[PDB]
Structure formats: C-alpha cells, structure tokens
Amino acid sequence: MADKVLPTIPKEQRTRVAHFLEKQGFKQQALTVSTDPEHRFELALQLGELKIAYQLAVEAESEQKWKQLAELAISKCQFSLAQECLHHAQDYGGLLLLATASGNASMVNKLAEGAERDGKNNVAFMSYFLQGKLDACLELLIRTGRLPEAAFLARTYLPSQVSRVVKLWRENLSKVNQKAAESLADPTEYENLFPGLKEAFVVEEWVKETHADLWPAKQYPLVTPNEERNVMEEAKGFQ
C-alpha cells in the first residue's frame, strides 16, 4: 500500500523513514530506500554489501572512510579487495600487518617506496632488512645520521662499508677534535679489518648462500615458500 505512496515521497522523507526502517531492523530494506552518502555509508557498514559499499564509496573521498571501512572489510575477511582499498588508502600500518603475516616482497617494494615516505627512521630499516638489503639499510642511515649504528651493521653483515663509513664518522668526530675523538684504523693497527680475518664475508659459504637465497629451506610447509633461520642456519653458516 505504502509502495504506492513511495513514489510520493522523495529526498529527505526517505531518510527519516529510513531511520525508522532501520529501527524496524529492516536493514536491507532500509538499504533499498537508502538515501544519503553518509546514510548509505553507515548503513553499509552495518549491511556489508561489500562491493556495493564500494560503489557507494565510489571514489570514497575520505581515507577516513577507508579507515573505517578497512576495519570492516578485514572483519569480513574480504582482503583482496581490502588490500585494494587499504592500498588505495595506502594506509600502511594495518595493511602491513596482513602483508607481513603471509609475507611479501612486492608489498615491500611499493612499501619501500612508502618506507621512504614515513619520516621516522626506524620502520624503514626493518623493511630494508626484511627485504634483505643491507644496502638499503645503510643508505637510509646516511640520511638520518645514524652513524655509530650504521657502522655496526656495516661491520656485522659486512658490506665493508665499515671502512668507508668509519672514515666519515670519524670525520665527524674529527670535526670535534681530540685524538681520542678522531680514532683511527682499518686493515691494521687499531683495527686489523681484513687481517683480523673473522665473520662477515667471503666466497664459499657465500656461494652456497647464493643459492640458498634462491631456494626454500624446507622442513614441511605450503605454497607460501620456506627459508627457516635458526640452529641449522648457524651451523651451515659457519661451515
């Protein structure tokens, strides 16, 4: 009966009543009448026509929508898309949590790009590492003035930037003269670098490694490939 009336209601009317309908709990039906982007939106949150919600979003026109929505999407476990929205949002933090949990390089490159974006030094490093990229970690340091720290990495996992880098750090120190403050040596004397001969470089292990990076470590797994990184690793690594 009402439907005959329905033509003979418009804009705003629909809204009020929609709220009534919503009160009725005739959410779907409430959806059908739906009439305000906001109105549609909130209801949409309740409702979850997911795709449908997207169309309403269309171009959302507010990350806040995406943020709100992201939580919702994620709940529905409509991730493929969620990723698209979140990505669309480029809302890195939550998105990272998923991406990381299954794992992914690709995410990492784009993200790397992002990593560059973020404005505090630390996250970006994990990324660089995570990717496996000393190089990236070290380059990053150059901008931030992480210098003592950069040396440790450069030493540990040797890109022998310890030599290069140390000179520069030392130079800062140098600026701030005093001989102790200057501090000096790479192959020999103070440090014996390559003459010490101990644990962050060489070819053979490295060759084995070269491959290693390429295969999946294995134990028993899924399509989501292996790498391990534990006891075993220590042993071969020494070899």
Partner: protein
Amino acid sequence: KGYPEVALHFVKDEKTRFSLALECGNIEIALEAAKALDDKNCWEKLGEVALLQGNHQIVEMCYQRTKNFDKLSFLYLITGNLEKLRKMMKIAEIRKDMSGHYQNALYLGDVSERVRILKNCGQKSLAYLSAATHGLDEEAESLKETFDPEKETIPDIDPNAKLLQPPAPIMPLDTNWPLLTV
C-alpha cells in the same frame, strides 16, 4: 678546558662533578657520576655518547637500565648471534604486546610467539598465514573450521621478501668493538 688534569686540581659534588663530566666530557667522572647520576635524561643521552666516545660493552649496561631494551635487542640482532634477543623477547612478550612480536620473528625462522599470537588474533587467519610453512597451516585450519570459518578472500602476500644477512666467516659481527685513541 685544556686537560681534565685541571679537573683534578679542583672539582666537587656529584652534581658539580657531573657538570664537569659533560664539560670536560670527563667520562671518567662520568662513570661514577653516572652511577651517582640518576637524573636519567642525563644518562639517557649519555650512554650513547659514551658509545660515541667508545665502548658498547659498557654502553649496553647503561642502556640496560634505561629501557632501550629494543635498542639493545637491535644490537643483538645486528651482531649475528641468537639468544639474548630471545630471552629479552620472552621478557617483553611476557610484558604484553599487539604489535611487537614481529621483532622476534624475522631474523629467526621459527617463532613461539605464534602460540600466544593466535590468542590475540585467534581468527585462525593469522595462524594460517604464519602457520603453513613449518608444514603446519593445518592447526590454523582446525580451529578455523570449529569456529564456523570466516575467511573467504586474501590479498597478494605469499612469502616473498628476504630475511637474510649477518655474518658468515671472515669480516665479523661485533660483539665487541676495538678502536684506538690514535
């Protein structure tokens, strides 16, 4: 200043001494001073500075009370050895967490965090994503089913980034770092 030999002719209270400890940079006096400092910030700058001047063997301690725990952890993972971080991991995991477990996992393969993690999540989702490769996707499914599952779509993420790097023989780690005033 001209030498801390100067410091020696005269100087006083730990507070004063401290001032000297910066002014000279008298970090000898600092050491004690530090002990006696406890004006945090004071420290707080200082261990680094101490490092900056030298010795992380010591610096680690300094930082230890300082609650730059993560930082120390970072030092440990930087270096190419495995335990210390793990106890620490225990001892901060044990002190709650929602975004931090991550620290333990990467340099590792295996994590135990997952046992805990699932509890925070408990949607079998995380548990699967994480799970599958030890050849263990399966338990994550068992619960997931039990629930009345809710997964239905996923995004890219197939393990594809390298958790690799650290320190095979020749050209170190650095537990301890040598130097020289020269």
